[PDB]
Design a protein around this nucleic acid. Structure first.
Length: 320
DNA sequence: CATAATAACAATATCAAGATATTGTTATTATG
């Protein structure tokens, strides 16, 4: 209760921008958050805080649990922005503890189901070739896609904040590996890849990737993308990227699902493990190494194992 | 009447075991 007044400038600016729009939805949630932070101003009693949060929770009732959790993240971030990390509301404005447990349960359950039913990525070579061809395109979006397919970085990392640099092999450059900076979703942890330049494998010669990236950065849309926030990047590119991926790998992607930009990261993991993995490491370890995870974290890699390579599928049936 | 824009709505994958930050889908709105 040290600060009793505050303003979440993010939401407010997002509303002022949306005051004059040609079309689209009405920012109802942003409005509820704004009115929330507004009502929070001047409060010193915690019972009324609890009542406010009880009503606000009572609002988003007939919705999805994931949606509710995400919205709670929104509210909490708004509170942190407006007042600070010392406000009692942060201990009040949180989700029911039995909700997060159900979430975790469902998550690990899904992963477990995916691990018992791997998808055979039969035409993966064609996809890799498609990305490699996108590496030589003049459309920055395409170059971005191909970069996702080849270096395996996330769309946010690739389009907004990647720094690929030549990796030395003793003396000269490495043909099948580059350097990378910086990782996303790290939240600035002690043992995360925050501000860490580490070596990653690539699925085509390093000169080609470096060239395509150098072209990507110096473009107009590339400059428009650099340093962008996640919401900005979303509203700017998300649907276009989605439909371009939709149209690209239309008839070469596994029939069990639809082409999504993040599948290229999974395929990157599987293939680079299939080609470059040393004999004294496990799959989880190599995955954690090349994907850049928290220190001593091998469970996050479990979410990246959903595909199975045709050759493995073949020689596994060789035991007949 | 489609039509495109827009944010609600939703799920996944990370750092840390209690949530945050990314990626992914659809209903609404103004408008032409």
């Amino acid at each position: 209760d040290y600060p009793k007044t505050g303003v979440a400038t993010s939401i407010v600016e997002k509303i002022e921008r949306a005051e004059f729009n040609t079309a689209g939805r009405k920012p109802t949630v942003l409005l509820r958050i704004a009115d929330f932070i507004a009502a929070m101003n001047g409060m010193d009693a915690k019972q009324d805080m609890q009542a406010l949060w009880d009503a606000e929770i009572a609002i988003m009732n007939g919705r999805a649990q994931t949606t509710i959790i995400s919205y709670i993240t929104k509210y909490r971030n708004a509170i942190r922005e407006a007042f600070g990390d010392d406000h009692p509301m942060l201990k009040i404005a949180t989700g029911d503890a039995a909700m997060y447990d159900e979430a975790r349960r469902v998550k690990m359950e899904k992963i477990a189901n995916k691990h018992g039913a791997l998808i055979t990525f039969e035409n993966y070579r064609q996809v890799l070739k498609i990305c490699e061809d996108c590496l030589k395109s003049s459309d920055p979006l395409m170059i971005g896609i191909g970069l996702i397919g080849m270096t395996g970085r996330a769309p946010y990392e690739v389009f907004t904040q990647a720094e690929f640099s030549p990796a030395p092999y003793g003396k000269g450059v490495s043909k099948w590996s580059i350097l990378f900076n910086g990782q996303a979703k790290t939240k600035q942890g002690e043992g995360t890849k925050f501000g860490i330049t580490y070596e990653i494998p690539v699925l085509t010669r390093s000169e080609t990737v470096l060239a395509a990236y150098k072209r990507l950065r110096e473009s107009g849309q590339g400059k428009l993308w650099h340093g962008m926030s996640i919401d900005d990047f979303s509203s700017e590119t998300r649907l276009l990227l989605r439909d371009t991926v939709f149209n690209l790998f239309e008839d070469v992607w596994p029939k069990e699902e639809l082409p999504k930009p993040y599948g290229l990261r999974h395929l990157y993991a599987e293939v680079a493990y299939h080609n470059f993995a040393p004999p004294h490491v496990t799959k989880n370890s190599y995955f954690a190494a090349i994907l850049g995870h928290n220190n001593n974290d091998l469970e996050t890699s479990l979410s990246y194992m959903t595909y199975t390579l045709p050759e493995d599928r073949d020689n596994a049936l060789a035991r007949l």
